[PDB]
Amino acid sequence: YELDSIYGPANGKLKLSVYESGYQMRSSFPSNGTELPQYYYTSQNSTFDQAK
Amino acid sequence: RNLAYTIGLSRSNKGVNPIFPTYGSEFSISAKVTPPYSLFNNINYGDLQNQKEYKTQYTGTTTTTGIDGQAINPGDYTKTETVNGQSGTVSVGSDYKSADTDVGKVDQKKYNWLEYYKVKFKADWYTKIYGKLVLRTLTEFGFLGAYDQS
Amino acid sequence: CNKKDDDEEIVPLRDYQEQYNTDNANIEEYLNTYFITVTDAPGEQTDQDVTFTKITDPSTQPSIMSYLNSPTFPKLLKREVPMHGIVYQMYYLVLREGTGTSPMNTDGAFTSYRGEYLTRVAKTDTEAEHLSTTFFEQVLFPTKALDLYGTIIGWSEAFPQFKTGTATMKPDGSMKYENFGAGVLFIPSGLGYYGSGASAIPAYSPLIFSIKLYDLTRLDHDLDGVFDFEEDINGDGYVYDFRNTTEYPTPPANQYDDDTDKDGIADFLDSDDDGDGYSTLFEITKPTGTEFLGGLSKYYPYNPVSDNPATPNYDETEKYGIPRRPTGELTNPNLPESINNPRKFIEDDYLAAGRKRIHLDNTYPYKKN
Numbered sequence: 083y084e085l086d087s088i089y090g091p092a093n094g095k096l097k098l099s100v101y102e103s104g105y106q107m108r109s110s111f112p113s114n115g116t117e118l119p120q121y122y123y124t125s126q127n128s129t130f131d132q133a134k
Numbered sequence: 135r136n137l138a139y140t141i142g143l144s145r146s147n148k149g150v151n152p153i154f155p156t157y158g159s160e161f162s163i164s165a166k167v168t169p170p171y172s173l174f175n176n177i178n179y180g181d182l183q184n185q186k187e188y189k190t191q192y193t194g195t196t197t198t199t200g201i202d203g204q205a206i207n208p209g210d211y212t213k214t215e216t217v218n219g220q221s222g223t224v225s226v227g228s229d230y231k232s233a234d235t236d237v238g239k240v241d242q243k244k245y246n247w248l249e250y251y252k253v254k255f256k257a258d259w260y261t262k263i264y265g266k267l268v269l270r271t272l273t274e275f276g277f278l279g280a281y282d283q284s
Numbered sequence: 285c286n287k288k289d290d291d292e293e294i295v296p297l298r299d300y301q302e303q304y305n306t307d308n309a310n311i312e313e314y315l316n317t318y319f320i321t322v323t324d325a326p327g328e329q330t331d332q333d334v335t336f337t338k339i340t341d342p343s344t345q346p347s348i349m350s351y352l353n354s355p356t357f358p359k360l361l362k363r364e365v366p367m368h369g370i371v372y373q374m375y376y377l378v379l380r381e382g383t384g385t386s387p388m389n390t391d392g393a394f395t396s397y398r399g400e401y402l403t404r405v406a407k408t409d410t411e412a413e414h415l416s417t418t419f420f421e422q423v424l425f426p427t428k429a430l431d432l433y434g435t436i437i438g439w440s441e442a443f444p445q446f447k448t449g450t451a452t453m454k455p456d457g458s459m460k461y462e463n464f465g466a467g468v469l470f471i472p473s474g475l476g477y478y479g480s481g482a483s484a485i486p487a488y489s490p491l492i493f494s495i496k497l498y499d500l501t502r503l504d505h506d507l508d509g510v511f512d513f514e515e516d517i518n519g520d521g522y523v524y525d526f527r528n529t530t531e532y533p534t535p536p537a538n539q540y541d542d543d544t545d546k547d548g549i550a551d552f553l554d555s556d557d558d559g560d561g562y563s564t565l566f567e568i569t570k571p572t573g574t575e576f577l578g579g580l581s582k583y584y585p586y587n588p589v590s591d592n593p594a595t596p597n598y599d600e601t602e603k604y605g606i607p608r609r610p611t612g613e614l615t616n617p618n619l620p621e622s623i624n625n626p627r628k629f630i631e632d633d634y635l636a637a638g639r640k641r642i643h644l645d646n647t648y649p650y651k652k653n
């Protein structure tokens with residue numbers, strides 16, 4: 083097999099760390115009479131990294 | 135309803151076997167005609183679409199809502215409008231001039247009594263060219279029309 | 285074999301009156317022989333959990349029935365629910381009353397509940413007859429609001445008697461709820477699942493639900509732009525539709541209460557809402573070029589609204605509500621008020637208190653020519 087959708091040098095190596103998240107995630111949340119959707123942004127790395 | 139009279143003149147001298155004729159010819163002329171109702175009845179088939187009786191109307195007796203979200207009172211004329219993707223009828227009020235013409239009613243009045251004329255002409259000729267070989271020439275014509283173009 | 289017979293023997297359908305009497309007796313016996321203990325965790329998820337235990341020391345054990353129409357919480361109340369021809373009576377205990385609004389019988393409720401079903405066990409040779417409560421479902425952490433319109437009749441009748449509470453999100457993503465309504469509702473089999481028995485709950489089994497109303501979500505079932513809580517003609521707080529012969533064999537005398545047009549369709553489920561022909565959505569739609577927009581929405585709200593801080597990318601400020609009949613000056617002093625010369629809106633038509641909104645008045649939109 084040949085890996086697909088790999089961006090960068092083929093000899094690249096990275097330090098992978100798999101942690102247990104300590105931040106509860108929800109798909110939606112009730113508001114002032116309405117059920118708004120929950121959105122997670124690309125700049126929230128600090129929030130998930132601190133609550134590990 | 136269709137009431138027509140047809141008269142046809144034919145001349146055939148072919149022979150001898152009807153399956154494989156070797157000589158003769160067959161000429162036929164036909165004409166089917168219907169009474170010219172348009173001449174006697176004083177009805178304008180061209181202005182039918184511009185009359186109140188041939189415009190779309192709401193025959194119900196309960197106030198309803200059209201595709202536009204407005205009231206459609208009983209007896210008011212209607213028109214077809216396409217709001218967003220779907221399409222539906224929209225009340226136009228008493229302005230029948232702006233309503234949609236009822237094609238079904240116009241066609242019904244136009245074709246309540248069939249009025250037309252049909253003419254058919256056919257010519258068939260058989261002849262022996264060489265030995266048992268025979269040549270057949272066939273020419274057919276057909277015309278359908280109306281007394282009033284309107 | 286090849287034939288397909290249709291022999292449905294679920295025709296029994298135990299009499300509504302007989303089943304209700306049996307369930308009521310079982311529920312009453314449970315309320316007299318059992319007592320409840322309630323936790324008191326202030327901010328934990330077990331803030332108002334209830335534990336039912338048999339009464340073996342009636343000297344100092346106040347039974348659930350002891351909490352009758354008491355003037356102090358906990359209070360056990362009775363709500364008359366007329367349905368199925370008979371008059372159902374549902375017992376519900378209010379351990380604590382919330383410090384917020386109350387949801388309608390057809391609104392969405394964000395709550396955590398633990399349900400159990402009551403089933404009288406036959407007296408065995410060595411064990412005497414008694415009542416047992418078996419657990420069937422529980423939701424400790426609510427995620428989505430439950431529409432009370434589609435839930436059992438018991439929920440839609442008891443929930444409007446409770447209130448919501450405040451909710452705060454902790455730094456770790458968890459949510460902390462406080463000052464919320466909590467209580468246990470004893471719903472008979474008729475108002476719950478009557479004869480279904482498909483789920484773990486056996487057929488004709490009274491249900492006991494321990495609810496904790498965290499929040500509520502206003503819903504609109506007719507999509508007319510007016511929410512169900514605002515389409516309640518009376519101040520009862522309940523909206524009913526009597527178009528179901530199974531639930532209402534004969535329309536009661538209280539009909540037409542939440543129906544302005546008297547067409548049989550309640551306003552919360554009707555689009556016209558007044559019989560004038562013009563839909564409610566069109567009537568509340570902001571006309572083009574009006575001098576009283578007051579917001580970014582294309583539909584006039586029932587009452588003035590304010591922005592939502594929870595929504596920082598949208599301003600919900602709507603300073604104008606659904607207007608009443610125009611009480612301004614005519615386009616032309618001559619001629620009578622009609623479609624040709626319409627009356628202009630002053631300003632107070634969108635803010636007066638007690639005004640007849642054009643969506644409930646069948647004479648404003650004007651006749652078409």
Ligand SMILES: CCCCCCCCCCCCCCCCCCCC(=O)O[C@H](COC(=O)CCCCCCCCCCCCCC)COP(=O)(O)OCCN
Binds near residue numbers: 143
């Ligand atoms: C197209 C539709 C309209 C068709 C109308 C049909 C008219 C009917 C005619 C009836 C016959 C005429 C009445 C008198 C008959 C006695 C014979 C004397 C008439 C005559 O002088 O002509 C004879 C033959 O032509 C005749 O007898 C007349 C010929 C008639 C026309 C022939 C064509 C008819 C239409 C068919 C053609 C299309 C094909 C479809 C079938 C020749 O007599 P003679 O040898 O002594 O000479 C005459 C010199 N003395």
Ligand SMILES: CCCCCCCCCCCCCCCCCCCC(=O)O[C@H](COC(=O)CCCCCCCCCCCCCC)COP(=O)(O)OCCN
Binds near residue numbers: 141142143163164
């Ligand atoms: C135009 C169509 C729309 C309008 C409708 C037209 C209606 C036409 C008139 C109705 C037809 C009946 C009248 C003619 C037939 C009577 C003849 C009797 C029989 C007969 O023996 O024929 C002899 C001549 O025939 C003849 O009469 C020969 C001519 C017959 C054919 C002429 C009719 C038109 C043919 C074309 C049709 C297709 C049209 C295409 C556009 C007359 O002999 P006798 O009885 O005196 O005895 C003496 C010897 N037996």
Ligand SMILES: [Ca+2]
Binds near residue numbers: 504507509512
């Ligand atoms: Ca509504």
Ligand SMILES: [Ca+2]
Binds near residue numbers: 517520523542
């Ligand atoms: Ca009501």
Ligand SMILES: [Ca+2]
Binds near residue numbers: 549
């Ligand atoms: Ca109605």
Ligand SMILES: [Ca+2]
Binds near residue numbers: 552553564
């Ligand atoms: Ca409505």
Ligand SMILES: [Ca+2]
Binds near residue numbers: 557561
């Ligand atoms: Ca209306």
Ligand SMILES: [Ca+2]
Binds near residue numbers: 593599
């Ligand atoms: Ca906002």
Ligand SMILES: [Ca+2]
Binds near residue numbers: 560
């Ligand atoms: Ca109206």
